[PDB]
Amino acid sequence: KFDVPEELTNKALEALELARDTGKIKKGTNEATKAIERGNAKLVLIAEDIEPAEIVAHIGPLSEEKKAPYIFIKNQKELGAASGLGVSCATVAIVDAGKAAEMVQDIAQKLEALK
Amino acid sequence: MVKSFYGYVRDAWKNPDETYVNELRWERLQVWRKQGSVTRIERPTRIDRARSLGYKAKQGIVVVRVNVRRGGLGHVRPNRGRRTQKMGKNKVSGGMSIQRIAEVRADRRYPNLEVLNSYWVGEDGKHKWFEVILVDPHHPVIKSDKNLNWVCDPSSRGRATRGKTSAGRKGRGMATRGKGTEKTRPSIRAYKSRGK
RNA sequence: UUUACUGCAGCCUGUCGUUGGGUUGUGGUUCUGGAUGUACAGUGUAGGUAGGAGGCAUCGAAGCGGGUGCGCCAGCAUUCGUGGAGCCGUCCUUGGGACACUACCCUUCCGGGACUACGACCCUAACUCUGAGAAGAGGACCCCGAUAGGUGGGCAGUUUG
RNA sequence: CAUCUCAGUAGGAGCGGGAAAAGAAAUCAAUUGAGAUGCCGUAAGUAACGGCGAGUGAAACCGGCACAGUUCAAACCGAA
Numbered sequence: 038k039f040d041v042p043e044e045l046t047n048k049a050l051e052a053l054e055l056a057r058d059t060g061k062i063k064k065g066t067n068e069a070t071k072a073i074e075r076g077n078a079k080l081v082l083i084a085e086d087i088e089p090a091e092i093v094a095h096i097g098p099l100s101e102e103k104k105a106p107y108i109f110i111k112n113q114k115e116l117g118a119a120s121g122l123g124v125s126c127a128t129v130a131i132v133d134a135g136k137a138a139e140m141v142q143d144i145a146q147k148l149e150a151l152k
Numbered sequence: 153m154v155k156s157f158y159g160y161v162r163d164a165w166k167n168p169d170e171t172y173v174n175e176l177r178w179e180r181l182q183v184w185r186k187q188g189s190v191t192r193i194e195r196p197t198r199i200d201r202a203r204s205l206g207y208k209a210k211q212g213i214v215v216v217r218v219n220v221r222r223g224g225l226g227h228v229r230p231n232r233g234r235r236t237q238k239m240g241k242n243k244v245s246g247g248m249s250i251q252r253i254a255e256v257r258a259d260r261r262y263p264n265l266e267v268l269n270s271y272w273v274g275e276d277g278k279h280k281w282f283e284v285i286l287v288d289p290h291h292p293v294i295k296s297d298k299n300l301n302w303v304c305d306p307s308s309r310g311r312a313t314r315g316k317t318s319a320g321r322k323g324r325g326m327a328t329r330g331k332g333t334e335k336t337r338p339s340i341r342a343y344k345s346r347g348k
Numbered sequence: 349u350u351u352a353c354u355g356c357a358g359c360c361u362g363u364c365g366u367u368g369g370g371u372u373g374u375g376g377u378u379c380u381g382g383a384u385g386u387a388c389a390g391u392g393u394a395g396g397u398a399g400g401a402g403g404c405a406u407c408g409a410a411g412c413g414g415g416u417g418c419g420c421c422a423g424c425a426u427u428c429g430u431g432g433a434g435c436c437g438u439c440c441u442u443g444g445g446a447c448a449c450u451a452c453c454c455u456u457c458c459g460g461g462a463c464u465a466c467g468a469c470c471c472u473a474a475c476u477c478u479g480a481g482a483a484g485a486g487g488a489c490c491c492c493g494a495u496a497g498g499u500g501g502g503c504a505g506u507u508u509g
Numbered sequence: 510c511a512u513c514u515c516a517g518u519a520g521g522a523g524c525g526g527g528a529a530a531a532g533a534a535a536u537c538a539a540u541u542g543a544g545a546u547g548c549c550g551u552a553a554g555u556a557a558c559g560g561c562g563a564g565u566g567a568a569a570c571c572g573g574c575a576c577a578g579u580u581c582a583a584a585c586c587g588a589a
């Protein structure tokens with residue numbers, strides 16, 4: 038996969054902030070995994086600086102098996118911040134786009150193309 | 153199914169040479185060989201194993217990776233009289249398992265803590281690696297915790313050195329009940345060490 | 349003390365693990381284009397044993413070139429062409445098998461593609477040595493763990509009525 | 510005398526309290542039962558092992574002492 042350009046990742050973060058304002062987000066790897074498995078995950082954001090890599094190694098193939106768009110954020114600090122959280126977050130899932138449904142689907146199409 | 157991500161970690165470590173854990177193993181063993189005997193780490197390598205063994209993300213709980221050599225009890229040939237049954241020592245491995253050796257070295261490095269449990273995390277032709285979970289019985293966070301404040305009792309000090317961890321009880325023959333445990337429970341020493 | 353008995357170290361060597369990636373050489377793994385199968389003569393190549401008889405065809409069936417599968421420069425397959433009727437057998441070419449275009453798994457056929465045990469070579473990326481390091485030299489060897497056989501008065505348990 | 514015995518004894522190292530360890534069955538049974546652990550009695554010098562030599566050597570059932578049950582990991586929730 039080509040490195041997703043910074044504008045697309047920033048749009049993903051903006052969509053995450055917007056869904057935090059209005060919609061519903063599952064922050065945390067357990068909640069995001071449950072949301073992907075249940076098929077409720079509109080968009081999955083995955084941090085790239087995870088130690089160990091076992092924490093979020095399954096998210097990609099799982100979301101590709103369940104047809105959930107996903108993107109890799111640079112690191113977990115601002116990923117946790119975008120979800121309004123005082124800690125880091127290895128992955129968040131947007132289960133309710135709220136006011137970002139249009140931008141979430143735009144990001145989904147862009148990810149589908151860039152693949 | 154709706155399985156937790158701990159289940160995915162468990163699956164990845166079930167057959168590690170057939171999953172992505174093999175490449176992580178190739179990259180990690182270099183770093184681990186560079187390290188010493190007892191290394192503290194921020195997070196467990198296998199989070200599901202640590203959590204099922206009692207690890208919690210709270211203050212007073214420490215996880216450490218220990219390095220232990222392979223093979224049996226490195227033994228010296230006696231230089232005095234023996235009866236040919238006690239002369240040979242090359243094939244005599246010990247009665248102390250490698251995991252319990254790792255637990256006791258971790259305990260030695262951390263005099264104020266108590267070993268909770270440990271799990272296998274890797275090995276090569278010369279070393280095995282275990283991650284040992286240790287608890288601080290004198291931390292107020294641990295004292296408040298009602299699932300862990302048993303470790304603040306006087307009989308819980310020196311757990312790993314008295315064979316009271318899961319690996320130690322496995323080494324004492326008390327991993328099972330019934331037949332075969334005639335000379336193991338309640339202790340090895342209670343039957344003149346004839347069990348094990 | 350030793351070519352006494354019985355062992356144990358050390359050492360030699362096989363195997364497994366450490367331990368990876370490429371190149372070829374060795375076995376079948378797995379299967380496409382052909383059912384390639386034929387003492388005697390054949391109108392005809394048992395079109396595998398067969399509902400012991402019964403389908404196609406100028407909208408295709410041959411006697412020909414090195415004869416594309418093959419083979420006794422015959423003949424089944426319609427093919428690059430041009431020549432202007434191959435049957436099935438109750439006249440069974442008095443059968444090692446005697447024969448309908450009817451899902452061929454089967455002694456062939458060599459794209460043998462794909463994983464595989466042994467062996468040879470190369471690579472570096474693990475690993476080893478040197479250096480404070482850049483790096484240099486080795487290198488999946490060696491070391492090491494385990495196991496198998498050997499050698500072994502080095503040692504040590506005795507026996508030597 | 511070599512396996513065996515002496516004996517997991519002697520001795521060693523580590524840990525550690527007023528006790529320690531064990532402890533709530535992936536148990537023991539047997540045709541159908543019991544129901545955490547420890548300790549005592551018995552089974553019994555029996556079963557078992559053994560140059561089947563010398564020797565070594567249980568457990569369950571059963572009778573007592575004392576009795577006690579529970580906490581996590583996960584599923585669901587998601588900082589409550």
Ligand SMILES: [Mg+2]
Pocket residue numbers: 189
């Ligand atoms: Mg040390």
Ligand SMILES: [Mg+2]
Pocket residue numbers: 307
């Ligand atoms: Mg106790």
Ligand SMILES: [Mg+2]
Pocket residue numbers: 501
């Ligand atoms: Mg001598």
Ligand SMILES: [Mg+2]
Pocket residue numbers: none
């Ligand atoms: Mg003697």
Ligand SMILES: [Mg+2]
Pocket residue numbers: none
């Ligand atoms: Mg216990």
Ligand SMILES: [Mg+2]
Pocket residue numbers: 565
């Ligand atoms: Mg004895």
